[PDB]
Design an enzyme around this catalytic site. Structure first.
Site, PDB file in Angstrom:
ATOM      1  N   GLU A  15      28.036  -4.077 -24.453  1.00 30.26           N
ATOM      2  CA  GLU A  15      29.353  -4.061 -25.074  1.00 30.26           C
ATOM      3  C   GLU A  15      30.181  -5.251 -24.612  1.00 30.26           C
ATOM      4  O   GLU A  15      30.588  -6.081 -25.430  1.00 30.26           O
ATOM      5  CB  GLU A  15      30.038  -2.731 -24.766  1.00 30.26           C
ATOM      6  CG  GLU A  15      29.241  -1.589 -25.388  1.00 30.26           C
ATOM      7  CD  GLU A  15      30.084  -0.361 -25.628  1.00 30.26           C
ATOM      8  OE1 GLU A  15      30.738   0.119 -24.687  1.00 30.26           O
ATOM      9  OE2 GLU A  15      30.088   0.125 -26.767  1.00 30.26           O
ATOM     10  N   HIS A  39      25.361  10.051 -29.838  1.00 29.48           N
ATOM     11  CA  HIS A  39      25.597   8.613 -29.815  1.00 29.48           C
ATOM     12  C   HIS A  39      25.147   7.933 -28.537  1.00 29.48           C
ATOM     13  O   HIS A  39      25.105   6.697 -28.514  1.00 29.48           O
ATOM     14  CB  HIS A  39      27.075   8.277 -30.072  1.00 29.48           C
ATOM     15  CG  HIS A  39      28.049   9.035 -29.223  1.00 29.48           C
ATOM     16  ND1 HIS A  39      28.624  10.222 -29.624  1.00 29.48           N
ATOM     17  CD2 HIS A  39      28.518   8.793 -27.976  1.00 29.48           C
ATOM     18  CE1 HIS A  39      29.417  10.671 -28.666  1.00 29.48           C
ATOM     19  NE2 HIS A  39      29.373   9.820 -27.657  1.00 29.48           N
ATOM     20  N   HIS A  58      26.143   6.778 -18.736  1.00 29.87           N
ATOM     21  CA  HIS A  58      25.396   6.612 -19.974  1.00 29.87           C
ATOM     22  C   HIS A  58      25.197   5.117 -20.188  1.00 29.87           C
ATOM     23  O   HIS A  58      25.717   4.293 -19.433  1.00 29.87           O
ATOM     24  CB  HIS A  58      26.141   7.229 -21.160  1.00 29.87           C
ATOM     25  CG  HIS A  58      27.478   6.616 -21.400  1.00 29.87           C
ATOM     26  ND1 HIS A  58      28.645   7.128 -20.869  1.00 29.87           N
ATOM     27  CD2 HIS A  58      27.832   5.516 -22.097  1.00 29.87           C
ATOM     28  CE1 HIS A  58      29.661   6.368 -21.234  1.00 29.87           C
ATOM     29  NE2 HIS A  58      29.190   5.384 -21.977  1.00 29.87           N
ATOM     30  N   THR A  96      35.289   2.966 -25.142  1.00 31.71           N
ATOM     31  CA  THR A  96      34.706   2.168 -26.214  1.00 31.71           C
ATOM     32  C   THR A  96      34.135   3.025 -27.335  1.00 31.71           C
ATOM     33  O   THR A  96      33.569   2.479 -28.281  1.00 31.71           O
ATOM     34  CB  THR A  96      33.620   1.226 -25.685  1.00 31.71           C
ATOM     35  OG1 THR A  96      32.507   1.994 -25.211  1.00 31.71           O
ATOM     36  CG2 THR A  96      34.170   0.290 -24.573  1.00 31.71           C
ATOM     37  N   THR A  97      34.259   4.340 -27.246  1.00 32.27           N
ATOM     38  CA  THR A  97      33.978   5.241 -28.348  1.00 32.27           C
ATOM     39  C   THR A  97      35.227   6.058 -28.658  1.00 32.27           C
ATOM     40  O   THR A  97      36.105   6.218 -27.800  1.00 32.27           O
ATOM     41  CB  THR A  97      32.816   6.180 -27.996  1.00 32.27           C
ATOM     42  OG1 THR A  97      33.119   6.864 -26.764  1.00 32.27           O
ATOM     43  CG2 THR A  97      31.536   5.361 -27.813  1.00 32.27           C
ATOM     44  N   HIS A 101      27.377   2.443 -18.050  1.00 29.97           N
ATOM     45  CA  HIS A 101      28.778   2.850 -17.793  1.00 29.97           C
ATOM     46  C   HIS A 101      28.825   4.093 -16.886  1.00 29.97           C
ATOM     47  O   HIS A 101      28.335   5.135 -17.306  1.00 29.97           O
ATOM     48  CB  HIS A 101      29.540   3.094 -19.109  1.00 29.97           C
ATOM     49  CG  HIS A 101      29.817   1.883 -19.931  1.00 29.97           C
ATOM     50  ND1 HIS A 101      30.191   1.880 -21.258  1.00 29.97           N
ATOM     51  CD2 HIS A 101      29.794   0.605 -19.553  1.00 29.97           C
ATOM     52  CE1 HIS A 101      30.357   0.635 -21.656  1.00 29.97           C
ATOM     53  NE2 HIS A 101      30.135  -0.155 -20.636  1.00 29.97           N
ATOM     54  N   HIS A 150      24.522   1.774 -23.309  1.00 28.76           N
ATOM     55  CA  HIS A 150      24.630   1.253 -24.681  1.00 28.76           C
ATOM     56  C   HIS A 150      23.488   0.240 -24.790  1.00 28.76           C
ATOM     57  O   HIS A 150      23.272  -0.526 -23.862  1.00 28.76           O
ATOM     58  CB  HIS A 150      25.960   0.557 -24.918  1.00 28.76           C
ATOM     59  CG  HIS A 150      27.105   1.473 -24.762  1.00 28.76           C
ATOM     60  ND1 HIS A 150      27.633   2.173 -25.819  1.00 28.76           N
ATOM     61  CD2 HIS A 150      27.806   1.828 -23.685  1.00 28.76           C
ATOM     62  CE1 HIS A 150      28.637   2.909 -25.380  1.00 28.76           C
ATOM     63  NE2 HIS A 150      28.754   2.710 -24.094  1.00 28.76           N
TER      64      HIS A 150
END
Ligand SMILES: [Zn+2]
Length: 257
Positions: free
Chosen positions: A103, A61, A91, A195-196, A116, A93
């Site tokens: 996000e 992901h 990582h 957030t995951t 992040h 997004h």
């Protein structure tokens, strides 16, 4: 399993992870006109001079750059934090298009991506114990806009071909994360969640006001990654971001006025 498609995306996560509807979920929209300037907030202290990166990994992901966190080598202190937080991984997004991908949002504005940097509270001994605590994690969030290239990002971009598919890993040593920081360290802060999944409410979010610029070509390479494993049908790794969640009983504070 959970992901970001039509049948397993964020609107579905609550069936396996009911804390998805909890009281301190992330990300949120940062309304700059209702955020409270708090003059009791301290400057952030970012000490990354001794950082030891180890590996880069496609986990299905996102891609994570992992660091040696067995000693206080790369730490975050100050700001709204008590104690010392060790960097474990960072990582990103990102979106399928330059107009989406972050996000968090600022006055409903979406950025092309969001970085992040994840840190854990040393008082809890290891990352797995930290996630179980309300003050266990500190995540530094940095927005990316498309413009000029970010030279300190290019080393990451160039290795992405070697980790195209889920479960692929490559050695990734001597990467300096100081190359990813903006000029100013002014920030907003609020208490939030991963957030995951598992979406644990263990995070003090520290979101920097100043975005960094990356080139169109750099973010294009993010979008060539794959959610799938090798030998499976190709699903491009894009739009791996969770939409903004209700602020509920929370206040966003700002280090600046
Ligand atoms: Zn993230």
């Amino acid at each position: 399993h959970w992901g970001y498609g039509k049948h397993n995306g964020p609107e579905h996560w609550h069936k396996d992870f009911p804390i998805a509807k909890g009281e301190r979920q992330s990300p949120v929209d940062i309304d700059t006109h209702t955020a409270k300037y708090d003059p009791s907030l301290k400057p952030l202290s970012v000490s990354y001079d001794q950082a030891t990166s180890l590996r880069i990994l496609n986990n299905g992901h996102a891609f994570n750059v992992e660091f040696d966190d067995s000693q206080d080598k790369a730490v975050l202190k100050g700001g709204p934090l008590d104690g010392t937080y060790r960097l474990i991984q960072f990582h990103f997004h990102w979106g399928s298009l330059d107009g989406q991908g972050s996000e968090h949002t600022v006055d409903k504005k979406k950025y092309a991506a969001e970085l992040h940097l994840v840190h854990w509270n040393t008082k809890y001994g290891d990352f797995g114990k930290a996630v179980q605590q309300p003050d266990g994690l500190a995540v530094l969030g940095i927005f990316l806009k498309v413009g000029s290239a970010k030279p300190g990002l290019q080393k990451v971009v160039d290795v992405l071909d070697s980790i195209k598919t889920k479960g692929k890993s490559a050695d990734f040593t001597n990467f300096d994360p100081r190359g990813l920081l903006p000029e100013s360290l002014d920030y907003w802060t609020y208490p939030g969640s991963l957030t995951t999944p598992p979406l644990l409410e263990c995070v003090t979010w520290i979101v920097l006001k100043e975005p960094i610029s990356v080139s169109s070509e750099q973010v294009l390479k993010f979008r060539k990654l794959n959610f799938n494993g090798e030998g499976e049908p190709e699903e491009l790794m894009v739009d791996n971001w969770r939409p903004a969640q209700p602020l509920k009983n929370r206040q966003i504070k700002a280090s600046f006025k």
